[PDB]
Amino acid sequence: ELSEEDKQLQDELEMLVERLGEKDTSLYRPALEELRRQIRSSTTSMTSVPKPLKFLRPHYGKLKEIYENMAPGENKRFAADIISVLAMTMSGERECLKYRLVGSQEELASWGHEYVRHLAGEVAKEWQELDDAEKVQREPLLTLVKEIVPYNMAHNAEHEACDLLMEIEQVDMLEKDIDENAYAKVCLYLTSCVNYVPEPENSALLRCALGVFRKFSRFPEALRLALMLNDMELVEDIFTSCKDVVVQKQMAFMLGRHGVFLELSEDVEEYEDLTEIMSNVQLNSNFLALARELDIMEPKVPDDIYKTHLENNRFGGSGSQVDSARMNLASSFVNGFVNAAFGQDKLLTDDGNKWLYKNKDHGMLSAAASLGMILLWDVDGGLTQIDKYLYSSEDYIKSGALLACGIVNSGVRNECDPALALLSDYVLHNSNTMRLGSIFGLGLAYAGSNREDVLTLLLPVMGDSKSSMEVAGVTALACGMIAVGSCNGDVTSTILQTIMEKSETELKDTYARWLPLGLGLNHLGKGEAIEAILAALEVVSEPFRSFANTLVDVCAYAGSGNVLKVQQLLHICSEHFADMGAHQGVAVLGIALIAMGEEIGAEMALRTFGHLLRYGEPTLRRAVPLALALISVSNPRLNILDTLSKFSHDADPEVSYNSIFAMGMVGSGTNNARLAAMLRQLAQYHAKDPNNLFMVRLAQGLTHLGKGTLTLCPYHSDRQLMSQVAVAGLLTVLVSFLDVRNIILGKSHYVLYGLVAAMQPRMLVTFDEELRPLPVSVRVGQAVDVVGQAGKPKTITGFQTHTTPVLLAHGERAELATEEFLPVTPILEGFVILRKNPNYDL
Amino acid sequence: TKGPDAASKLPLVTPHTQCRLKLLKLERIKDYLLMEEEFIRNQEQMKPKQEEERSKVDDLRGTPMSVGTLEEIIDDNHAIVSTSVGSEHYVSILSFVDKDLLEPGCSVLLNHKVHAVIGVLMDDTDPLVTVMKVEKAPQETYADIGGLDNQIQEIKESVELPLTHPEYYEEMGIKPPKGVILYGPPGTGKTLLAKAVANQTSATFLRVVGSELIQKYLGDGPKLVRELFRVAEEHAPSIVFIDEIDAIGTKRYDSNSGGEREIQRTMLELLNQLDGFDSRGDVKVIMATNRIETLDPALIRPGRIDRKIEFPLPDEKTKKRIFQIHTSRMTLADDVTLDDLIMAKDDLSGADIKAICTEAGLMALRERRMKVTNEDFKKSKENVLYKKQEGTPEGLYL
Amino acid sequence: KVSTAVLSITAKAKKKEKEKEKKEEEPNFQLLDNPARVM
Ligand SMILES: Nc1ncnc2c1ncn2[C@@H]1O[C@H](COP(=O)(O)OP(=O)(O)OP(=O)(O)O)[C@@H](O)[C@H]1O
Ligand SMILES: [Mg+2]
């Protein structure tokens, strides 16, 4: 019950509210003045219970009607203020809003923080309740926001300000209202909220954050959000606005990492240095330094990688003297991938022709591509060795050499463009293998280029009726992955015409799946323009109509997180009815690629995939491991590996094959000794089937990629920056792997080399302002945010001290433990430039 | 093989602030859960073979199915099986049974009427052991532990790093530590660290009290310990946490005490499981005890327990970290200076800091305040801290 | 089958789809013969 002070205050409140019965002149001003005074005193204090509000439980009906009849001036406004404060505690949402709306304006700050928050919530509720039928109510709510937002800004309440500004769908005022000490908080809030908000508000929020960062001149972050938006005009605007040459070099490094090559005018000083950095010619050299820091110059051999000295030699000296072709292809992939990018191998460099001569047709192409893939990012160094094998006796393997070129020029660009020159006279080659090699090399060398000359040169291949189905598919995929995430009308129209003119009998083959691929590869991350795409694709008949629609639906929403598209895809998967299950497989890959945008969505996609596996039909069971591989590329999560190990022994050969490839992709480059042991056990168990052995050895090569210093992650910048080229590469490999026997185990091993398009390295090489390497002590650990929305860089814990260059595993980041240097980019990934601290004093 | 049964956990939703970002992440979780529900509801609804297989096998075996103990395998289809009443019967082994699974002492499903071997029971796990397995991972994570960097690093190198990165251990040649005892004054973070590692680990986790592994009947104690460790072996990557090992880890000594000798037999079986004849495999053991000096040397010796992680009373930096973590969900005022609580030598532990925060919240609620102040914390310090009586000598020492 | 709510954005999506749709736009007797059956 009450107290003496409480009872006296209750009596005073009751007297003040009861005096309003009649219309005496000295009632409305005195009583409302007293109520205003008490309410303001209680509300403008600590969060203590508002004692006047607790005591006040009257009815305002008489108060509302008298409001209607008495004092059209300020007294009704005082009454409105009082009833608004009273109804903030009660449930009078619309009335409580309109009391502040039409009553005494004064200011929302004069009431209290809680009153401001409640008014903000009610304003958001009304705005969501108000449609475009009338804009009369919108303007006063906007005026309320005009004062609500600065209140939150000045009282560290940026949460409510940002939320309200997202409800009203208007975010322009953040440009003119954000302070120096609060830009990071709101910017991080937006860059985290963009992933979960659906279309089209995510793009508006992204451009709002872009404008904020431009206003505060945080140019690297502006570049990050510009690549998030995937629009070149604002990237060019940021490039022009960058007046600091060190920031220019940093943004060139990040552009090269993302693979975005924008033409630079000669008006910008130091054009040559920026161009050569963006071409990423230096990377290999740094990689070499990397390797000579870890004493891993010496390349490995497949015999030691398989560890034959440990396998139980049940048949000794009688069952291993025969060298089958398929195991030779697997050993080529191993003695490639494992030793790749180190500039040397002990079996393909000194005994090349002898090795290649024990391969047949497809083995020739695979080994020729692996010869270039054993030396990465050295265009001249790679081609100096590739030319002789291009001059080979078996001119059919010439195409393979082109792959080598295309696999050597990957991740780099030259002014003279050796790849374009070398393949310009070979693209029009009538031989199917020659044209295939030419187009594949051109695509791999020019991933993400979007250069009009190469696209125009690739156009006539689609209209060539002579060109075979697999030539058409490889051409379509190369065109798509040269024009990743651009919605190029030229390529879209060309592929649409090619598929429209294609016959059903010729469409029934597996390679026709690669026709939507490039089309889909033209529309990565842009789901707005795909209504016309689906309308155009609706002309073709089912089932391939549904197949193409599903594939373009995946490609449109790559990482979008649109749960409605995932619901449609899950409905497709759950429909229990050969080619009919292709739709379900593509939809499963769609759930994977949409959910990999967000960590939460991905981890729930894990549970959905488990449910699909334990309760799905054979086609879904085959499809899921590819999805699991897509979800966690180069992220050896133990639960995923355990599920894949459980299903590697399944009685369905396709399911086991897909599970093995999922081991290879998920644990790629992590050098996981547990994964290596499990793969050795799988090789021992599957020692009889050539296909299982081939794919398990491929998985071992993938997991020993670069001796553990290479990753296939399509994500960068704390996994927030997507990579269109890498996403394209994994998409091609996975959709080809939807049919392992006909494509992977058939005539199309070269498709595996598309993963090298996604081949991106991990280091911590630190450069000075002049780009010389600089050893800096670095604190490396997990980025587990021990705070909420404090704006912290996840507050790296699990500390370990390192000297650069350093190797960072997936999910573990780094920070500068020394204040002597300041990084231009606060995200310590890849090559960075540290400016000497001017604030530090000796 | 029977790979690990890792506990399931929902993704962490951060920030923990009551903002729209938390709403969006939680609603994404709800979306995906509803997707799973819709798929799992429409799966069996659209299900239109093996039914003949079931109608034959189940009819042949019939219900109920008795559970007996295999004793001898006479022929390829005849076996001497002892029923639970201890009576042996020469019964037949039906065709639909894997002859390689039958081993002496195995649990075998028999027909109710003719007791013929109709199948083999695989698990036959003691209910007191299957309850030790953790199904719901605890919510406490490594981000909820203030300070304790050395202790967390040691426990990660022991039970976490070998699972994720066995490459270092295999390359250098070390066998990773397979036994850790978390010892120190109470309320320092031993059980909290066990909760955190259980949350983080991808391997199966078994939680023991060090006293539930003790049974009434004469031989069921060591047998229960053996069953628990065998279950840990089954799910190969395993972590066996035995809180309050003091209950059984006490030092061996000679007395009549007919129950104490069984106590010592149980602890002897435990140390045999830890390191005795035959290898232990890839199962780690985490032990916690307030008093370590009272433990038997043969239990905490290296090889059985490789690491002894000390949990001291938190220092100034650690105490400040505890206060920052445990008031993160609070709404602190501007007049609060936590430093005064962190300084002085009250010898307050992490649990003491948690109680201080809780009592400060209660003090604020007493004044009808949802935001705490410095005075509330000061009152809570004296209100809660009154634990020890004297603990100190007089003014002898200058 | 059944369609789940997914109330996170399904209401907004359906209302915006509705806006898009708006943008898009006795005897009383019987004659009988000789063998007539009558109740
Ligand atoms: N270093 C710490 N960081 C954060 N919280 C801590 C810390 N130490 C203790 N706590 C808090 O104290 C609570 C109780 O401590 P805990 O359960 O870890 O006790 P203990 O050290 O195992 O003691 P006992 O000897 O009773 O087993 C934990 O739930 C946690 O919230
Ligand atoms: Mg405890």
Chain C interface, best mutation among A528, A560, A564, A569, by max C CB count within 10 A? A564
Pocket of ligand 1 (CB under 6 A): B 144-148, 186-192, 288, 290, 322, 325, 350-351, 354
Q: Answer whether A571 sits within 8 Å of C10, measured CB to CB.
A: no
Contact A348, A355 (CB under 8 A): yes
Return the CA Rg of chain B: 27
Cα separation of B131 and B134, whole Å? 8
Cα separation of A64 and A67, whole Å? 5
Residue whose Cα lies nearest atom 6 of ligand 1: it is: B350
Pocket test for ligand 1, best of B192, B325, B387 (most atoms within 8 A of CB): B192
Q: Retrieve residue A774's tokens.
A: 């600089």
| Residues from chain C contacting residue B34 (CB–CB below 8 Å) | 4-6
Number of separate helices (H) and strands (E) present in chain C: 1, 0
Does the annotation list B184 as a binding residue?
yes
Q: Which of B38, B45, B46 sits opposite C4 (nearest CB)?
A: B38
Helix (H) or strand (E) holding A7: helix A4-18
Q: Retrieve residue B112's tokens.
A: 């109710």
Number of separate helices (H) and strands (E) present in chain B: 15, 10
Contact B79, B91 (CB under 8 A): yes
Does the annotation list B191 as a binding residue?
yes
Minimal CA–CA distance to B180: which of B204, B205, B154, B145? B154
SS3 call for B183: strand
Contact A635, A666 (CB under 8 A): yes
Bridge partners of B179, per DSSP, are B285
Residues in chain A whose C lies over 2.5 Å from the next residue's N (breaks after): 577
Ligand with minimal distance to B197 CA: 1
Q: Which of A189, A603, A674 sits opposite B21 (nearest CB)?
A: A189
Query: Is the Cα dihedral A444, A445, A451, A456 positive or negative?
Result: negative
Minimal CA–CA distance to A338: which of A726, A664, A625? A664
Q: Which residues contact A177 (CB under 8 A, 6 or more apart)?
A: A149, A150, A153
| Alpha helix positions (H), A464-578 | 469-482, 489-501, 504-507, 514-521, 530-537, 544-556, 563-574
| Cross-sheet strand order for the sheet of A821-823 | A766-767, A832-836, A821-823
Q: Retrieve residue A111's tokens.
A: 């009431």
Compute CA distances B317 → A567, B212, B331, whole Å.
49, 37, 22
Q: Answer whether B20 sits within 8 Å of A193, measured CB to CB.
A: yes
Cα separation of B87 and A770, whole Å? 88
| Residues from chain B contacting residue C2 (CB–CB below 8 Å) | 38, 41-42
Q: Answer whether C1 sits within 8 Å of A574, measured CB to CB.
A: yes
Q: Do strands A777-782 and A812-816 pair parallel, antiparallel, or not at all (unpaired)?
A: antiparallel
Which of the other chains make 3 or more beta carbon contacts under 8 angstroms with chain C? A, B
Contact A745, A738 (CB under 8 A): no
| Residues from chain A contacting residue C12 (CB–CB below 8 Å) | 198
CA B243–ligand 2 middle distance (angstroms):
7
Residue A328: what residue type?
N
| Residues from chain B contacting residue C7 (CB–CB below 8 Å) | 30
Q: Answer whether B32 sits within 8 Å of A601, measured CB to CB.
A: yes
Query: Is the Cα dihedral A540, A544, A546, A550 positive or negative?
Result: negative
Contact A595, A604 (CB under 8 A): yes
Minimal CA–CA distance to A729: which of A447, A488, A469, A375? A447
CA A801 vs. chain centroid, Å, equals 29
Cα separation of C26 and A618, whole Å? 58
SS3 call for A133: coil
Minimal CA–CA distance to B99: which of B80, B77, B82? B77
Going by the DSSP 8-state scheme, the letter that residue A50 receives in this structure is: -
CA B280–ligand 1 middle distance (angstroms):
30
Contact B210, B247 (CB under 8 A): yes
Compute CA distances B393 → A593, A686, A731, B385, whole Å.
68, 73, 74, 20
CA A740 vs. chain centroid, Å, equals 27
Contact B261, B215 (CB under 8 A): no
Cα separation of B38 and B41, whole Å? 5
Q: Which residues contact B92 (CB under 8 A, 6 or more apart)?
A: B77, B78, B79, B114, B116, B117
Cα separation of A634 and A533, whole Å? 33
Going by the DSSP 8-state scheme, the letter that residue A722 receives in this structure is: E
Q: Where are the beta strands (DSSP E) in A672-771?
A: 710-711, 715-716, 721-722, 760-761, 766-767
Q: Which residues contact B155 (CB under 8 A, 6 or more apart)?
A: B180, B182, B193, B197, B286, B309
Helix (H) or strand (E) holding B339: helix B339-342
SS3 call for A368: helix
Residue A801's Cβ-count burial label (10 Å; 0-12, 13-18, 19+) is: exposed
Minimal CA–CA distance to A725: which of A493, A492, A445, A474? A445
Smallest CA–CA distance from B42 into chain C, residue = C1
Contact A418, A383 (CB under 8 A): yes
Helix (H) or strand (E) holding B285: strand B283-289
Q: Answer whether B27 sits within 8 Å of C8, measured CB to CB.
A: yes
Task: Determine the distance in angstroms separating the CA of C1 from the nearest CA of chain B, rounded to an integer.
Answer: 6
Contact B273, B280 (CB under 8 A): yes
Cα separation of B64 and A295, whole Å? 66
In our burial notation (b when 16+ CB lie closer than 10 A, e otherwise), range A323-355 reads eeebebbbbbbbbbbbbbbbbebebbbeebeeb
Which residues on chain C place their C-beta less than 8 Å from a C-beta of chain B?
1-8
Q: Which of B13, B42, B368 sits opposite A48 (nearest CB)?
A: B368
Long-range pairs for B140-144: beta carbons < 8 A, 24 or more residues apart:
B140/B192, B140/B195, B140/B196, B140/B199, B141/A784, B141/B12, B141/B196, B141/B199, B141/B200, B142/A782, B142/A784, B142/A797, B142/A798, B142/B196, B142/B199, B142/B200, B143/A784, B143/A785, B143/A786, B143/A797, B144/B192, B144/B196, B144/B325
Q: Do strands B78-82 and B238-242 pair parallel, antiparallel, or not at all (unpaired)?
A: unpaired
**HEC readout, A305-353:** HHCCCCCCCCCCCCCCCCCCHHHHHHHHHHHHHCCCCCCCCCCCCCCHH
Minimal CA–CA distance to B331: which of A164, A179, A113? A113
Cα separation of B288 and B208, whole Å? 10
Contact B155, B193 (CB under 8 A): yes
Helix (H) or strand (E) holding A412: none
Q: Retrieve residue A221's tokens.
A: 């972050």
**HEC readout, A240-287:** HHCCCHHHHHHHHHHHHHHCCCCCCCCCCCCHHHHHHHHCCCCHHHHH
CA A268 vs. chain centroid, Å, equals 31
Q: Around Cβ A1, how many Cβ atoms within 10 Å?
A: 4
Cα separation of B224 and B152, whole Å? 31
Cα separation of B169 and B162, whole Å? 7
Q: Which of B31, B45, B46 sits opposite C8 (nearest CB)?
A: B31
Q: Answer whether C9 sits within 8 Å of A574, measured CB to CB.
A: no
Q: Around Cβ A276, how many Cβ atoms within 10 Å?
A: 16
CA B46 vs. chain centroid, Å, equals 40
CA dihedral A716, A721, A722, A724 (to 10 degrees): -90
Task: Determine the distance in angstroms separating the CA of B50 from the nearest CA of chain C, rounded to an integer.
Answer: 25
Q: Retrieve residue C14's tokens.
A: 């359906």
Q: Answer whether C8 sits within 8 Å of B30, measured CB to CB.
A: yes
Cα separation of C9 and C4, whole Å? 12
Compute CA distances A208 → A154, A169, A721, whole Å.
20, 11, 18
Cα separation of A450 and A232, whole Å? 12
Helix (H) or strand (E) holding A436: helix A432-445
Cα separation of A441 and A438, whole Å? 5
Q: Do strands B238-242 and B117-120 pair parallel, antiparallel, or not at all (unpaired)?
A: unpaired
Minimal CA–CA distance to A521: which of A498, A555, A488? A555
Q: Which residues contact B23 (CB under 8 A, 6 or more apart)?
A: none
CA B177–ligand 2 middle distance (angstroms):
22
Task: Determine the distance in angstroms separating the CA of A122 from the nearest CA of chain C, rounded to an integer.
Answer: 19
Return the CA Rg of chain A: 32
Tokens 């300041």, residue? A822
Cα separation of B43 and A615, whole Å? 8
Q: Retrieve residue B159's tokens.
A: 């039970």
| Residues from chain C contacting residue B31 (CB–CB below 8 Å) | 6, 8
How many Cβ contacts (< 8 angstroms) between chains A and C?
A: 14
Does the annotation list B185 as a binding residue?
yes
Does the annotation list B186 as a binding residue?
yes
Q: Which residues contact B363 (CB under 8 A, 6 or more apart)?
A: B372, B375, B376, B379, B380, B383
User: What are the phi and psi torsion angles at A798 (to 5°)?
Assistant: 60, 45
Residue whose Cα lies nearest atom 12 of ligand 1: it is: B351
Cα separation of A644 and A630, whole Å? 13
Q: Do strands B238-242 and B204-208 pair parallel, antiparallel, or not at all (unpaired)?
A: parallel
Contact A767, A831 (CB under 8 A): yes
SS3 call for B170: helix
CA A193–ligand 1 middle distance (angstroms):
34
Does the annotation list B373 as a binding residue?
no
Chain B interface, best mutation among C4, C7, C10, C12, by max B CB count within 10 A? C4
Contact A424, A443 (CB under 8 A): no
Q: Retrieve residue A681's tokens.
A: 């056990």
Q: Give chain B's largest Cα–Cα span.
A: 91
Minimal CA–CA distance to A470: which of A514, A427, A426, A429? A514
Q: Which residues contact A722 (CB under 8 A, 6 or more apart)?
A: A228, A525, A558, A559, A597, A714, A715, A716
Bridge partners of B93, per DSSP, are B117
Cα separation of A13 and A212, whole Å? 49
Cα separation of A819 and A167, whole Å? 41
Tokens 């004092």, residue? A71
The closest-lying atom of ligand 1 relative to the alpha carbon of residue B311 is 21
Task: Determine the distance in angstroms separating the CA of B382 from the nearest CA of chain C, rounded to an integer.
Answer: 48
First CA to last CA distance, chain B = 66
Q: Retrieve residue A10's tokens.
A: 């209750």
Cα separation of B105 and A272, whole Å? 79
Contact A653, A691 (CB under 8 A): yes
